[PDB]
Design a protein around this ligand. Structure first.
Ligand SMILES: [Zn+2]
Length: 103
């Protein structure tokens, strides 16, 4: 439920969305990796921002477990997850961007 055991690091880009997959939180690291200003990110579709709209749909996130390599210069491993409330209802989505040269 509320506890997502998705693996995350201090240096990770993090993006969080609403139910429509529109970005509502993005940290400094994610902006850095994307090479984009917060103003061009907040409120835009996460999958558009990640250049995935051709490849991936929001519907797939829940039943998906696969992480993907993405060119953002930087090669990131992206892992998507759902944000789920107490009653099992999905409230939004998370992308975790791991720099491939991490650790
Ligand atoms: Zn990481």
């Amino acid at each position: 439920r509320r506890l997502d055991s998705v693996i995350t690091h201090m240096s990770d880009g993090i993006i969080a969305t609403d139910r429509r997959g529109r970005i509502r939180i993005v940290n400094d690291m994610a902006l850095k990796m994307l090479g984009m200003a917060k103003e061009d990110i907040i409120g835009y579709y996460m999958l558009s921002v990640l250049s995935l709209e051709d490849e991936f749909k929001l519907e797939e996130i829940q039943e998906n477990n696969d992480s993907f390599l993405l060119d953002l210069g930087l090669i990131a491993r992206v892992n998507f997850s759902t944000i789920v409330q107490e009653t099992g209802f999905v409230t939004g989505y998370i992308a975790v961007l791991h720099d491939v040269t991490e650790q």
